[PDB]
Design a protein around this ligand. Structure first.
Ligand SMILES: NC(=O)c1ccc[n+]([C@@H]2O[C@H](COP(=O)([O-])OP(=O)(O)OC[C@H]3O[C@@H](n4cnc5c(N)ncnc54)[C@H](OP(=O)(O)O)[C@@H]3O)[C@@H](O)[C@H]2O)c1
Ligand SMILES: CC(C)(C)n1nc(-c2cccc(O)c2)c2c(N)ncnc21
Ligand SMILES: CC(C)(C)n1nc(-c2cccc(O)c2)c2c(N)ncnc21
Ligand SMILES: N[C@@H](CCC(=O)N[C@@H](CS)C(=O)NCC(=O)O)C(=O)O
Length: 275
């Protein structure tokens, strides 16, 4: 059939850029680097061109629904869909940030959970058979899960939870921080960690829906942690290079055709972790 296409969100720097670079070399088709800032995105494309690579570019800010929709329309028009989607874009307040916690919660949740969700709402319908979806979560999601109340752990581990139930819970965390009741209500103290619970559970729900609604289509969807990577997020003391951080996401993006799994798993260092 037609030309295959892979796309990475937050592709202008850090792990996203390393993922783009690797897909340029390893993905059999076009690779679209996306970035919210057009200047930074184009600069990244130029960087890869100087390395001998040929990524395409399209603007994308996962917090602007019009930007997501424009990208959706582009993919439909130019490719008739999408083969690989890497939801890499994410943010985190610094450990030392004095920003009031409730603002940290609202802002981090807005991008990491709601932005990622919005991208999936518009782009999952475009995924072609044998496609792969990779959601970059964090081992912090596993850590944060342990600090939730037993009641919340049960909900987050549920095999029957719906996307709309999860949306309610994520917004509940944010609202609870605003009311000064998040601890009493069973939430952990890491806003970032809770947003990544959101990403992990969203992955589990979307994998279920793919298996239930698109049987036979051979689509695999997983959450992952890239490990601790030297980027503008984690800082210079981290143990992995962006190259090393890209290995697990690229692995999940390029699972060979007809492969049975992993599917709906949380993967770290190419290995399935218990949720
Ligand atoms: N140790 C680690 O570094 C580590 C570990 C586990 C998980 N992660 C996860 O790995 C992913 C990549 O992080 P990183 O370490 O590479 O961080 P980074 O260097 O800060 O890069 C983050 C990328 O996401 C983009 N982004 C942020 N908000 C966006 C938005 N609203 N719309 C579109 N793009 C947006 C950023 O664009 P700008 O350049 O415009 O800001 C940048 O391209 C994140 O999801 C992070 O949570 C990182
Ligand atoms: C073997 C892969 C495809 C992973 N790879 N990686 C790299 C590579 C090497 C150093 C840094 C980097 O980001 C990527 C590479 C290269 N330069 N030439 C040919 N193949 C390369
Ligand atoms: C700060 C420590 C070293 C605890 N850290 N931070 C992170 C980390 C840093 C930035 C983002 C993230 O999701 C996690 C991390 C990791 N992924 N794996 C192991 N250790 C990690
Ligand atoms: N108070 C924040 C802490 C978030 C956090 O742990 N940030 C880490 C990455 S996940 C970070 O920015 N580390 C680098 C640094 O602080 O220099 C929250 O609750 O979300």
């Amino acid at each position: 059939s037609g030309i295959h296409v892979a796309l990475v969100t937050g592709g202008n720097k850090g792990i996203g850029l390393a993922i783009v670079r690797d897909l340029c070399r390893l993905f059999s088709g076009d690779v679209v680097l996306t970035a919210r800032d057009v200047t930074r995105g184009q600069a990244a494309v130029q960087q890869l061109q100087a390395e001998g690579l040929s990524p395409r570019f399209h603007q994308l800010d996962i917090d602007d629904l019009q930007s997501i929709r424009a990208l959706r329309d582009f993919l439909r028009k130019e490719y008739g869909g999408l083969d690989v989607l890497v939801n890499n874009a994410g943010i985190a307040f610094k450990v030392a940030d004095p920003t009031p916690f409730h603002i940290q919660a609202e802002v981090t949740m807005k991008t990491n959970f709601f932005g990622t969700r919005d991208v999936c709402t518009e782009l999952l319908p475009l995924i072609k058979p044998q496609g792969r979806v990779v959601n970059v979560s964090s081992i912090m999601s596993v850590r944060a899960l342990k600090s939730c109340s037993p009641e919340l752990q049960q909900k987050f581990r549920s095999e029957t939870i719906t996307e709309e139930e999860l949306v309610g819970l994520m917004n509940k965390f944010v609202e609870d921080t605003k009311k000064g009741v998040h601890q009493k209500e069973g939430w952990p103290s890491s806003a970032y960690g809770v947003t990544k619970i959101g990403v992990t559970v969203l992955s589990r729900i979307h994998a279920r829906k793919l298996s239930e609604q698109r049987k036979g289509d051979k689509i695999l969807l997983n959450a992952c942690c890239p490990g601790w990577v030297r980027t503008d997020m984690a800082g210079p003391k981290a143990t992995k290079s962006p190259e090393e951080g890209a290995e697990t996401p690229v692995y999940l993006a390029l699972l060979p055709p007809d492969a049975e799994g992993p599917h709906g798993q949380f993967v770290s260092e190419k290995r399935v972790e218990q949720w």
